[PDB]
Amino acid sequence: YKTKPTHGIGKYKHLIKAEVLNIHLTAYDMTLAESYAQYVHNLCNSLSIKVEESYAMPTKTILTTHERVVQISGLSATFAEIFLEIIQSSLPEGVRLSVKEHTEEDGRFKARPELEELLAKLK
Amino acid sequence: VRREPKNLSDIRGPSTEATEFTEGNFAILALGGGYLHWGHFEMMRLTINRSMDPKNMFAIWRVPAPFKPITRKAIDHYVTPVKAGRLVVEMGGRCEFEEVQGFLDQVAHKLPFAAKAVSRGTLEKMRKDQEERERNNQNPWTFERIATANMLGIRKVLSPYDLTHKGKYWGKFYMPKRV
Amino acid sequence: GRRQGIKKMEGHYVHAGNIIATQRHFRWHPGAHVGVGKNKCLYALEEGIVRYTKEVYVPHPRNTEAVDLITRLPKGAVLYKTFVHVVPAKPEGTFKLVAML
Amino acid sequence: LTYFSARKGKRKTVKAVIDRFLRLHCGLWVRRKAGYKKKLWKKTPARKKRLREFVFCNKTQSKLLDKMTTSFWKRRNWYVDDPYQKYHDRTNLKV
Amino acid sequence: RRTPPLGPMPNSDIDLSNLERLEKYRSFDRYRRRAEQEAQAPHWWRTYREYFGRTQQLLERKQAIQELRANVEEERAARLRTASVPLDAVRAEWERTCGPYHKQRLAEYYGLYRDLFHGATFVPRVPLHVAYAVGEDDLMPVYCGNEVTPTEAAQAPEVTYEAELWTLLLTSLDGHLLEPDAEYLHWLLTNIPGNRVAEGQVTCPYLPPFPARGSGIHRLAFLLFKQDQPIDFSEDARPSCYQLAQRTFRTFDFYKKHQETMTPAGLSFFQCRWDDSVTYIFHQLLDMREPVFEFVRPPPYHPKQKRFPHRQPLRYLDRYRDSHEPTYGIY
Amino acid sequence: KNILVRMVSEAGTGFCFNTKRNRLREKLTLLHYDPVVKQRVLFVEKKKIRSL
Amino acid sequence: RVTSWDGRKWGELEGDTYDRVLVDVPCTTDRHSLHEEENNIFKRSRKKERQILPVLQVQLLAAGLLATKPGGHVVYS
Amino acid sequence: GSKAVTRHRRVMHFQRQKLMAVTEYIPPKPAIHPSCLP
RNA sequence: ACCCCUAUACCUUCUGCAUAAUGAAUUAACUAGAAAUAACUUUGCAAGGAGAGCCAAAGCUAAGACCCCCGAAACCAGACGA
RNA sequence: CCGAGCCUGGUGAUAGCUGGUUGUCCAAGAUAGAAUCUUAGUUCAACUUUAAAUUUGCCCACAGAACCCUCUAAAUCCCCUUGUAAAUUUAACUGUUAGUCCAAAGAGGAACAGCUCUUUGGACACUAGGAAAAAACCUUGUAGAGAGAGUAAAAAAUUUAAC
RNA sequence: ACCUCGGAGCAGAACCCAACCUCCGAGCAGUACAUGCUAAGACUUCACCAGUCAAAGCGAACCUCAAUUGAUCCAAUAACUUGACCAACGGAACAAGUUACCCUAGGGAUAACAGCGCAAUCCUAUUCUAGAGUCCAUAUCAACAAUAGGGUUUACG
Ligand SMILES: C[S@@+](CC[C@H](N)C(=O)[O-])C[C@H]1O[C@@H](n2cnc3c(N)ncnc32)[C@H](O)[C@@H]1O
Ligand SMILES: [Mg+2]
Ligand SMILES: [Mg+2]
Ligand SMILES: [Mg+2]
Ligand SMILES: [Mg+2]
Ligand SMILES: [Mg+2]
């Protein structure tokens, strides 16, 4: 109750909120690429580096090579030093290491729970 | 696109916003509460620009662009609510008070609410004299003591806001002589 | 309106089955000796005295909608809910001599 | 209702009252719930039971019913095996 | 109107501008643990709790643990999860170590300390054993809080422990009839010559537990005392069968008189209900008729009866009816 | 859309109850408690009472 | 996902999110109007609706063209 | 009735006006005027 | 006696009404609250009361005490009228 | 005196509509709402009165009564103490419920008109004094005689341009 | 265009309460088939009718949903049960126009004129100096504004 000194003890939603690099890891072998992707992701989790997605686009038509990508964000310029050095050293077998960026031309399907407050703030 | 019910509470009470001198010596202090039309602003820009050269002296809009809607027998136009105490227009540069006061107060005359062109020194001066007057008073009885104590049952007549208002505000009107 | 509110205030004596509160959503949560109905209506399971306290909330593991909220909550944080309690007044029964046999 | 009959000059009972209500000798009146036979498919079982029960009437309803009915209906009846025999008298009633 | 908080409000300190950097309770169980921790912490606001109120030992241990895990055959059991522990062996040497410490809790849970000695707890160091002989072949063990019928407990039990004088005591805490607080004294032995029990003097002869019918479960405790020097006990105990009003005493008042002389060492307590044996105790040993007790319940609540009980089922009238048989007045 | 239909029991004969079904659905055979026999028994359709 | 909101808001709610869009705007319902009596769009009391009918159509279409991906396909019916 | 905020100066309740009369500022005047003093 | 001072006729329908609106020239005569259930009050008798019938788980018998005046346009039946 | 003649009778037609209603004296005594072929009316409730039975009532201190919305005021509920004398229940009837103005919080969309509507409170259908006469502003209530006395509210202030 | 029920704008913290108006929905659907029987004590849309929660007990098993609805009589049925856009939604078993040929009882002139209130509209004067006046603010005009007064118009009340 408002006047009582216990007020707003039930407040919860203030603690939450209701309101970029891409790494290529292509290999011919399909037993190798995902393993190293796993490893990089684990390194990211440990050092508090935000990850978006690990997307995979289909194998090239025939001979056949498939691409594994990891999205990373929150990396500082200074911290990049340490990070990139390790991911270069850990390279398993002639895997093309790329660092790609969103070029403002690379929209998401919003969930029903997310849409209601979005609508509320829209109007 | 939303219509607003007319909340006259905005004009009531002292201005707590844009009451600070910012990179400028001279400003027009509002002594009352009113809504500014676009016509007012048109006059503002015209007069100030034609008076003094912008290279030597600079003028600053310290008031937001109109956004409060007005409903008329549907929304027709937009207005800006201003409470008493807001510096509406700031002016700075290598200049003197004597030479600016003329056009500045002339521009302030056309304002719908009461207003005064003031320097930094003059504004702070009047703040000082007012707060000296309140401690200098020879009347045992202030509005403050009576209102808060509920002395004569005066709260029956008074409003809840009056306690905050110290009796210095009555509608859109600010009384500086009141202590 | 729906006439929903607190029926029995703090330190009120309440017989078993009485309504403590009615609510559209879960404003007050059932505590000790307090049952909740189909319509979230709080009633006294025992005769006694009503108390209102703040207690730390742990939802049922199966109840995903609240569990997920807990998961998103940062470390060190605890949800508090208001809980209503009936402190029973009279002990369950007494032992009495019937006969010397 | 008819205060004075044209044939005998005495009060008359409203027969609408007699085929809906049971009056107990003590002064209470018993009714059934309205719509207890109506649309039972849509009603909930708890609702259904609340409907089947025979209820009492408040003071004003009871007063109105007594005015609408003659003294004959208020006498004491010693029926053989009426299922309402016990309810005719009160027990442990202080005001 | 607002009133400032009297104490540190929860979640106030831990908040930050950014949340993305912070670790969340990824697990349900994580939060659960923290919530439990919060329940123990005292709070300024109203809480449910308010109203519902040497060095070489380590060296040997590490050596023995290293020796145990050394054998490959031992570890072969655990990985196949077809592994066992000697239950008896664990029990045997637990009593030496963590026996008394656990036993303290049970005594305070059953409220022995609060009832016997007004909350004056002690750790029961000596591993006391009591056995009750049933026939010739088997004897019932008395643990802490165990259930034993007074049929079995009809004669003097066999008590054994490591010892170097002593005083042995048996009390029925809740057994008493005439007074609430008071207790009966079953059999008292003083100036016990160590391990040997029989040679010590018999102050009070053995009496079996006698809990009345429907009086529920009765707890009976053995108390042992470390007697440094012998004492003459002029307590007016008169061996004969007995008269109950002489068996009544207070353990607290008894120990008060002899605080400095002796100190407790071990406890063992058993619970019991009524049995057919108890009947013979009143009849033979006491020469009195058996008291029987019932658990009754308080009368049901009904609101004050109204003259016009509006929108009530017809059965409202039957709530305030005392008899079920028809009545006729003057008729 | 739905229709109300009457359900009678094979066993404990002389008891019936009412239920909803879609018109498009197959003829309804059900299991329900009969207090005549004080047992859970099979029930079968006889007729449609009304359309709802 | 089934939602019951104004279709016009979608343009500013979600953008560049769909590769395929189908826009079935409210029309005069020619066959339906000729046959159905009740709730007819042509009922003379509801004349006002028809005056604000054409603009609405544009609005709804536009919302689709704002929500579609670059190179995304919208069909209007 | 009328709104609390008006374009013109609203007429007060008499009681309130009597209050305004009583709680007016009084300036202190010295026994000897300061300008006349050296 | 007047002069002095104080004093916004009555009824009725409206929240105010001074006054606004109906009603009154004045005198005499005439001109408008009729009853039950149930309660209360005071008696007689009392597990019974009542001068058949009826009521009764202190009731029953008796008494006392409660329910206005004037006014339409109409509708129908039978006579009378060119 | 014919959109259906006149007379007698039914007939004291019916009228939620208008008008009227007859000795003296004293006492208690006002504006929650609901349904209604209903808002010119009834019925129920609320208030009101009388009689009866019995025990608490009013004022109240601590403790207590929500999150969400992105932000919250005068306050309100509950309530021992206390100061007080009323309250609930039972029996029996009537009658009343179209208000207006002022202060405050608001919304109507003219910063709005003794203009409309919701809430809190005051006043008016009861006496008296004062503001010019004066429903609503201020002072004041329990009744008679007096050629005694003390008081309450209670009478607007203001005067101006040289250099 | 409406008449019943539930929301959204108004609702600040027990209950109730932003009229009128402007808008959004409801006249169900899905899942069980113990949506069995019985019974302490309570809540309630300001009456009544209706509506709502529920301990314990007898017998078994190891509901979602904001509204989603309809009295009596009567009719159908062996019984159990069923029946309305009675939506004018507390529901008359079943009935439309026109009257300036009109009548009676009344209320007002809550429709208009007459009389009143505000002054949105309109009228007038001042205050500021843009800009005209082939130079020149104030011979005479006059921009964007502010400040006053009257009650002639047009609306509002
Ligand atoms: C013409 S129907 C669509 C055709 C039909 N669903 C089909 O696939 O054949 C369009 C519907 O859109 C609805 N609608 C109206 N306003 C809308 C809006 N602003 N946004 C989306 N739908 C709207 C109308 O109710 C209308 O029935
Ligand atoms: Mg009248
Ligand atoms: Mg007149
Ligand atoms: Mg002729
Ligand atoms: Mg009427
Ligand atoms: Mg009086």
Ligand SMILES: [Mg+2]
């Ligand atoms: Mg009604």
Ligand SMILES: [Mg+2]
């Ligand atoms: Mg009707």
Ligand SMILES: [Mg+2]
């Ligand atoms: Mg009518």
Ligand SMILES: [Mg+2]
């Ligand atoms: Mg109290």
Ligand SMILES: [Mg+2]
């Ligand atoms: Mg009126």
Ligand SMILES: [Mg+2]
């Ligand atoms: Mg709303």
Ligand SMILES: [Mg+2]
């Ligand atoms: Mg109610």
Ligand SMILES: [Mg+2]
């Ligand atoms: Mg309500």
Ligand SMILES: [Mg+2]
């Ligand atoms: Mg049960």
Ligand SMILES: [Mg+2]
């Ligand atoms: Mg209706």
Ligand SMILES: [Mg+2]
């Ligand atoms: Mg003509």
